[PDB]
Design a protein around this ligand. Structure first.
Ligand SMILES: Cc1cc2nc3c(=O)[nH]c(=O)nc-3n(C[C@H](O)[C@H](O)[C@H](O)COP(=O)(O)OP(=O)(O)OC[C@H]3O[C@@H](n4cnc5c(N)ncnc54)[C@H](O)[C@@H]3O)c2cc1C
Ligand SMILES: Cc1cc2nc3c(=O)[nH]c(=O)nc-3n(C[C@H](O)[C@H](O)[C@H](O)COP(=O)(O)OP(=O)(O)OC[C@H]3O[C@@H](n4cnc5c(N)ncnc54)[C@H](O)[C@@H]3O)c2cc1C
Ligand SMILES: Cc1cc2nc3c(=O)[nH]c(=O)nc-3n(C[C@@H](O)[C@H](O)[C@@H](O)COP(=O)(O)O)c2cc1C
Ligand SMILES: Cc1cc2nc3c(=O)[nH]c(=O)nc-3n(C[C@@H](O)[C@H](O)[C@@H](O)COP(=O)(O)O)c2cc1C
Ligand SMILES: O=C(O)c1cc(=O)[nH]c(=O)[nH]1
Ligand SMILES: O=C(O)c1cc(=O)[nH]c(=O)[nH]1
Ligand code: FES
Ligand code: FES
Lengths: 261, 305, 305, 261
């Protein structure tokens, strides 16, 4: 009903090197409202029981569709088998799941910074779309390993009150290097930050903006149940000694530093 | 439910034999959002230890062919919190749902402390002694050692004591007999086998703990072998588990010699797997000439030698 | 083949590490129709016993999730026939294909008789002592007993002696050490785990033998666990097997500590699985920074503690 | 090439209670010449590695197709998953395999008896088609549990020099009972017999025609490799003491009594 559904594949195309964009259609889209939430998809292989957690990149309310961008591995992975799906194929889906990004609690006069990289970039698209509907400044800094991997540029720059900066480690397109270089250039006073990407990048962001109150980090972890019952996807709270946080239920997104709920 | 599915086990008056396995259902909070937990015969909650435990470093899970590996490390909020929050929550919302409490520890004294207390909870109808945690076990591989423990816990428990066996042994028969002679009211089996997975890029084991427990349909044949082996010479009931994913499996466990059935890993694949099994069970029984599970148990029991 | 795939093991100069597992390739006659057996590093033929054996009653096989059960019962035409027909056939058609002879028996004297003779065959380059047949084993569960046997056979063998371990034990380490100290040139592992399947209509086990050996991708994590465990404290090479179905698996066995890899059950699913693995192997090595399997062995070996 | 191929499903329809008829198209049809040979099909499920052995019911040389009739089990079986295949779907096939029925060694003046029952009936269709091209008398006795299960009648009676007799245990259509009843009625002198069906039925046939030289029995067994290497599908030769016969390589079809090669 509202938790699981056999969604239909509207389309599936490869948009970057080994990165696919799948558009799903189904009633589950109705429960979506927060950015950063994820879908737990089932692989079309009876020998692969663990569902793959992939964030929602965006959704169309009127068209009743949702779009996810994901990277595939070799012949033996599930994402690979997922990418073989044609138009009309059914996908067993569990979602929306997780705590999304806190959006409707910011003014129309704030300076927003959104930092992304690699496959962490997709959920950040729906974030900007939701913040554009509110008003103020948005400066998105996106980093990639190579241009061959670069995704969502056309639709990110197609947003109003948005300033987009792309960076690339080796396979250069924008500013040569890592997102850390872009962070160094920004002058304005940031009031909120939203990040999602590689653990190394998240470490740089949390370190540079150590005492920024509204610092939101979307985390990744190896999951199983996806609802908070198995205790697989666990992380430490405000220091080792405290509570244990589940990235599937308490997260994906948490508060600042090396994790606070 | 209906009469054809009900089974009577020590301390457990189940409406149907479907029980979610320990560590796969938390304390019921998460899955309650999905469906009415009252549809279940009982629940085997996560291991409780004397002191709260964080567990092992991550990653804690990995996927294998028709199964998965886990090395959670017995994470639980401790006895105190479980006695005051977890169990009471279940008793407040689902007063008629009998629960089986899973007990673990690093030494006899730890097991003893938990067994002596956990029975006070009104809704806890039986204890499942976890002497088999893989990654528990140092107690499940020696008959005399297991027996010593079981005897001590039995002397302090206010509810029936079920003992969870490990499949990681050369001969499970001596262990089963010893545990029975020591006072166990029943047995549950099996816990997980041990396995490892390596990441080709890092050349390191995927799990931080290196080794983990293997569960899922992959281990069903091993579970059946052991249950069948043990059922041939034990006079106490066995609640079977290991790779059950559908109603057919449930029935297969019965043919092997189990009285009730627990479902673990399947919940991860399909959160409604339990209610589905319960619904499909009567149709399947019709097809295989089974009037009631109570009659099936006796039939399998007398068709021995 | 090429240098990057070649490995040197006692008595075995393999062009690539892909070896069909015993009982899954007969004596090579059937699969020769499918492809040039010379593409293989070696072959592990079916168990040879002193006297011809028919085996167990049928059914002898059953399917499980990502695996299968078998209870063939060691069927083979006997030593005499194997020495005069089977081995000579392989030597006449594939003179350069080194073969590993699998030896089994019901008692020490039986093993001894076969080991002393089978080495005369020009093409037999090593012996694989099968002390682990599930359904063998009464020799693979006790260290002192296994060691006694290995010592006796080693004294009579003209070719290197590899010992096949059983995963159905509480602790495989003592067994491995004992066998090494007794003179074994190498180890191969693992043989099958034990399982059972029940037919819902008959309420009887599917296999006539009741129990059977479980193989296939389902047991890969267990095989890796054991290989890794044993590799940490043995100074002799290990040829790994258990659930290998592709080149990635082959590489995973290497990370666990194996020097060569055997493929069993996968041949049933895809008769060309071996040549395919051999062909895909170099590409995969490129991708994971592996220059040669010979270098991989050493790298995994020194990255210990 | 000539041993395995990803054949295409031309069509798949349910022709009787839980019995499907699948028409496959592929070059493997070229190697077919003997009736009774089988195909080892792979189930579209990675958790089910054992291929299912199903006899070839008939094949069209010019159209390059082959047809197989098979019964399905419940949701957990492979045949069930096999029956879900649509037009254009690919099926991993291994075949032709096994020793077929000896056809081109009979005169155009012999009295042929073909006895069948249940799912053993399909391979016997190509047998009659091959014998019709030769000449003489053919009397097919087909038995079924019920009319609901009855298959291939329309095409069996559509054959020249053929006399068809149907029997049904309970769900009556033809003569009420088992094939043993029909065997009792036949007067003419039989020179050759071909059988394929349930072990019980095969026992009755071999017992009644104990000393009929040309008695061919097509056997069934639990298989794995399908080529004669695993030694799973074994049977006893002329009495327990002798050779061990593999139903996949030496068979499916063998000589008279309780098995002779
Ligand atoms: C909350 C969350 C959101 C995510 N959102 C996205 C997204 O929008 N786009 C995207 O491309 N990726 C995303 N990922 C990562 C994605 O889930 C993994 O890359 C993917 O599950 C790996 O599966 P596989 O098909 O390669 O399978 P395999 O590699 O065969 O592995 C099988 C098992 O390993 C798990 N697994 C393996 N590697 C990882 C990994 N790095 N992280 C998590 N699980 C792993 C699989 O989920 C599965 O259960 C997200 C992860 C999480 C936790
Ligand atoms: C030479 C030969 C020819 C056959 N020809 C036909 C035919 O033309 N039409 C037809 O309908 N059936 C035929 N069968 C029987 C058919 O192979 C089985 O009914 C089918 O394989 C059962 O598979 P399943 O999909 O139900 O799987 P499951 O029941 O899930 O079982 C999985 C495993 O059990 C094996 N298995 C289970 N039951 C049987 C059985 N009774 N016989 C053999 N293997 C079994 C499967 O093949 C498989 O490997 C033939 C069998 C043989 C040996
Ligand atoms: C994530 C996870 C955690 C588990 N934790 C426990 C536990 O707390 N205590 C226990 O007795 N068994 C635990 N189990 C094991 C079992 O409940 C169970 O025996 C099972 O894995 C075998 O059955 P299954 O194949 O249905 O999962 C755990 C299993 C999993 C997968
Ligand atoms: C049909 C069958 C027969 C086997 N017979 C033997 C045998 O003769 N001797 C032996 O050492 N192992 C035998 N094996 C077991 C192994 O060769 C092998 O260890 C294997 O099953 C585990 O690897 P796999 O998963 O690749 O099959 C047999 C396995 C199968 C499936
Ligand atoms: O908590 C765990 O890791 C655990 C405990 C146990 O008993 N078995 C298991 O597979 N996991
Ligand atoms: O011949 C057999 O049955 C057999 C022997 C052996 O060593 N292992 C196995 O799984 N099967
Ligand atoms: S995926 Fe199970 S607790 Fe997070
Ligand atoms: S199916 Fe393997 S020998 Fe017949």
């Amino acid at each position: 009903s509202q938790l699981q559904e056999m969604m239909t594949v509207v389309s599936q195309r490869e948009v970057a090197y080994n990165i696919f964009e799948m558009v799903l259609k189904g009633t589950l889209v109705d429960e979506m409202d927060l950015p950063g939430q994820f879908l737990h998809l089932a692989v079309p292989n009876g020998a692969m029981l663990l569902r793959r957690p992939i964030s929602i990149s965006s959704w169309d309310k009127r068209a009743k569709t949702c779009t996810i961008l994901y990277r595939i591995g070799d012949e033996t992975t599930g994402t690979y088998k997922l990418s073989k799906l044609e138009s009309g194929a059914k996908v067993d889906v569990m979602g929306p799941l997780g705590n999304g990004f806190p959006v409707a609690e910011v003014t129309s006069t704030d300076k927003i910074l959104i930092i992304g990289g690699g496959i962490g970039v997709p959920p950040l698209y729906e974030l900007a779309k939701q913040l554009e509907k509110t008003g103020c400044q948005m400066t998105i800094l996106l980093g990639f390993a190579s241009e061959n991997v670069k995704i969502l540029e056309n639709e990110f720059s197609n947003l109003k009150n948005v300033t987009l900066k792309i960076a690339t480690d080796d396979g250069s397109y924008g500013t040569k290097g890592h997102v850390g270089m872009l962070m160094n250039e920004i002058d304005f006073e940031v009031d909120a930050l939203y990040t999602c990407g590689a653990p190394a990048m998240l470490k740089a962001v949390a370190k540079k903006y150590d005492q920024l109150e509204r610092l939101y980090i979307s985390m990744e972890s190896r999951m199983a149940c996806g609802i908070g019952a198995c205790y697989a996807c666990v992380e430490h709270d405000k220091e080792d000694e405290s509570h244990a946080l589940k990235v599937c239920e308490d997260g994906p997104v948490f508060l600042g530093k090396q994790l606070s709920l | 439910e209906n009469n054809r599915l009900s089974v009577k086990l020590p301390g457990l008056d189940l409406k149907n034999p479907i029980i979610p396995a320990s560590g796969c259902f938390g304390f019921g909070e998460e899955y309650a959002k999905y469906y009415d937990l009252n549809k279940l015969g009982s629940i085997m909650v996560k291991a409780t230890t004397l002191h709260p435990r964080f567990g092992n470093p991550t990653p804690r899970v990995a996927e294998t062919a028709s199964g998965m590996l886990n090395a959670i490390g017995l994470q639980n909020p401790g006895l105190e919190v479980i006695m005051t929050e977890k169990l009471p929550w279940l008793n407040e919302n689902f007063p008629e749902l009998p629960i089986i409490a899973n007990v673990a520890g690093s030494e006899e004294a730890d097991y003893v402390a938990v067994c002596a207390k956990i029975g006070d909870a009104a809704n806890v109808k039986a204890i499942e002694l976890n002497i088999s945690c893989p990654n528990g076990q140092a107690f499940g591989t020696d008959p005399e050692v297991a027996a010593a423990l079981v005897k001590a816990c039995k002397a302090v428990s206010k509810v029936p004591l079920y003992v969870k066996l490990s499949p990681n042994v050369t001969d499970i028969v001596p262990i089963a007999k010893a545990v029975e002679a020591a006072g166990a009211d029943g047995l549950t089996m099996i816990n997980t086998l041990m396995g490892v997975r390596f990441d080709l890029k890092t050349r390191q084991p995927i799990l931080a703990n290196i080794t983990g427990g293997l569960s899922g349909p992959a281990i069903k044949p091993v579970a059946l072998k052991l249950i069948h082996q043990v059922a041939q010479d034990v006079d106490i009931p066995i609640i079977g588990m290991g790779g059950v994913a559908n109603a057919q499996d449930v029935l297969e466990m019965y043919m092997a010699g189990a009285s009730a059935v627990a479902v673990g890993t399947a919940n991860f694949a399909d959160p409604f797997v339990c209610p589905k099994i319960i619904d499909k069970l009567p149709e399947l029984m019709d097809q295989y000439r089974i009037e009631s599970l109570e009659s099936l148990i006796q039939e399998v029991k007398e068709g021995k030698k």
